[PDB]
Design a protein around this ligand. Structure first.
Ligand SMILES: O=C([O-])C(=O)[O-]
Ligand SMILES: [Mg+2]
Ligand code: NA
Ligand code: NA
Ligand code: NA
Ligand code: NA
Length: 320
DNA sequence: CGGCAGTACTG
DNA sequence: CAGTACT
DNA sequence: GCCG
């Protein structure tokens, strides 16, 4: 990154808009930041700033003030509430609206939340693990977690396929959580396995808390045995084999990469989800799907790329 | 002007 | 439904 | 916030 002197100032404003609920402006900042981090050289001119995709008049103006002034005046008028809103929205299950409500009600600390806030079941678990969920784990621990799930699943049916996705599959040295995708090549024996799989992982003591228990998605908390272990976020998704490639693609990410790929599909009259890539998709004038297209056959991730007219990208090159 | 990805889960 | 979360 |  040739422009840290810019981005680290911009990230502060981005975070402020985000925790305050200004989602679209924060998205604009996030895109301008990544564009700046991918630039090959320091941006040294206003029109050079305007050069880059994701940088407009407003953003170029801010970069010009930073190079001349070494500073961004807007940083000095960020509301005093933002550090507290960030503290609160780092509770799993509390977002901008809950954080703002707690702030309005006078709460200022996690002690205030603990002693006085009404918490959902999910939020109470997030608060209990507040520090642990802000920490990343070594890649090698994510391996142990994936393998724990795989062995529990394969105890029931040796034919079950289990793949760690997310940042793990993209090759990162540390992971904020573990994402495990499960399917069965026969296209049938994936059904109704959650109850037994989750029960098995609980009997161990491995699964410590459940955040979400849906028919296809589980989100929760695990901890490996022994001393020196922290609680870690674990997501599991079980999908039919017919959807494996799109589910693998979705779950491997990155989030930015998925959104960019899905935006591309839309421009070409298609739609991409975790379930399928569809074509001949009819939408209204607001980009809204009003008529469903046809599912396209996507036996492998490469097929999704190919049908989108894209060169194949290995997971490591999807880390956007 | 208005979209900015598409979906699952919770209560 | 609105809110939050996942990639 | 940016961009079509
Ligand atoms: O945890 C993550 O950030 C992921 O899965 O990409
Ligand atoms: Mg993940
Ligand atoms: Na530009
Ligand atoms: Na949160
Ligand atoms: Na009080
Ligand atoms: Na996850």
């Amino acid at each position: 990154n040739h422009n840290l002197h810019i981005t680290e100032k911009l990230e502060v404003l981005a975070k402020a808009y985000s925790v305050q609920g200004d989602k679209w402006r924060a998205l604009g900042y996030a895109k301008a930041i990544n564009a700046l981090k991918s630039f090959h050289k320091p941006v040294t001119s206003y029109q050079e700033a305007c050069s880059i995709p994701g940088i407009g008049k407003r953003m170029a103006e801010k970069i010009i003030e930073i190079l001349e002034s070494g500073h961004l005046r807007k940083l000095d008028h960020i509301s005093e509430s933002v550090p507290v809103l960030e503290l609160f929205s780092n509770i799993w299950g509390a977002g901008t609206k809950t954080a703002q409500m707690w702030y309005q009600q006078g709460f200022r600390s996690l002690e205030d939340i603990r002693s006085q806030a009404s918490l959902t079941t999910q939020q109470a678990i997030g608060l209990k693990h507040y520090s642990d969920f802000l920490e990343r784990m070594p890649r090698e621990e994510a391996t142990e977690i994936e393998q724990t799930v795989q062995k529990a699943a394969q105890a029931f049916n040796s034919g079950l396929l289990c793949v760690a996705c997310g940042s793990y599959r993209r090759g990162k040295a540390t992971c904020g959580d573990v994402d495990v995708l499960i399917t069965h090549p026969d296209g049938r024996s994936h059904r109704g396995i959650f109850s037994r799989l989750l029960d098995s992982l609980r009997q161990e003591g491995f699964l410590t808390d459940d955040l979400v228990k849906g028919e296809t998605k589980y989100l929760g908390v695990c901890r490996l045995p022994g001393p020196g272990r922290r609680h870690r976020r674990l997501d599991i998704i079980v999908v039919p084999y017919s959807e494996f490639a799109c589910a693998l693609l979705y779950f491997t990410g990155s989030a930015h990469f998925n959104r960019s790929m899905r935006a591309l599909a839309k421009t070409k009259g298609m739609s991409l989800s975790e379930h399928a890539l569809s074509t001949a998709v009819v939408r209204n004038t607001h980009g809204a799907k009003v008529g469903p297209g046809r599912v396209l056959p996507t036996p492998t991730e490469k097929d999704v790329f190919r049908l989108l007219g894209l060169p194949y990208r290995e997971p490591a090159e999807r880390d956007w």
